[PDB]
């Protein structure tokens, strides 16, 4: 999928995760987060389409979604503990660290 929908299941999900009452929930509302993230460490945003792939900013744009799975991976490791609330206080400091990205390129 392109960029802006991924970006929107990542969105969503967020809100999904902060409604959630039970684990499967928090759980399967990560797991598309992952998929998303995933999809859109393979796009380049319109601000960076004159930049190469292993330029300085295409590699740190591939690199935040290295770290965005690395805290749905830990989410979902607490989820899986069965962790609800701990789960939701993760993914509230993972909401926090998306606007790092958007601020150098969105
Ligand atoms: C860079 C490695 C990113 C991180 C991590 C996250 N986002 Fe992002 N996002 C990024 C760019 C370059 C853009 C602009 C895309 C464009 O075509 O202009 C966006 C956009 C969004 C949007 C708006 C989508 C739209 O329809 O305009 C949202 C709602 C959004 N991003 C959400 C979001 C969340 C919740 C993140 C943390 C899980 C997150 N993004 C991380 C780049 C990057």
């Known amino acids: 999928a392109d960029l802006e929908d991924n970006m ?3 969105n969503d999900n967020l809100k999904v995760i902060e409604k959630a009452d039970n684990a499967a929930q928090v759980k399967d509302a990560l797991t598309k987060m992952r998929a ?3 999809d859109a460490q393979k796009a380049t945003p319109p601000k960076l389409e004159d930049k190469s792939p292993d330029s300085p900013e ?3 744009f591939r690199h935040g979604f290295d770290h965005l799975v690395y805290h749905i991976d ?3 490791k607490l989820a899986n503990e ?3 609330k701990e789960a939701q206080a ?3 400091q993972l909401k926090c660290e998306c606007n790092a990205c958007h601020q150098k390129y969105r």
Do not use: H, I, N, P
């Open 36 to 38: 998303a993230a995933l």
């Open 74 to 76: 830990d989410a979902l």
């Open 90 to 92: 993760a993914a509230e």
């Open 8 to 10: 929107e299941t990542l």
């Open 82 to 84: 069965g962790k609800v």
């Open 58 to 60: 295409m590699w740190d």
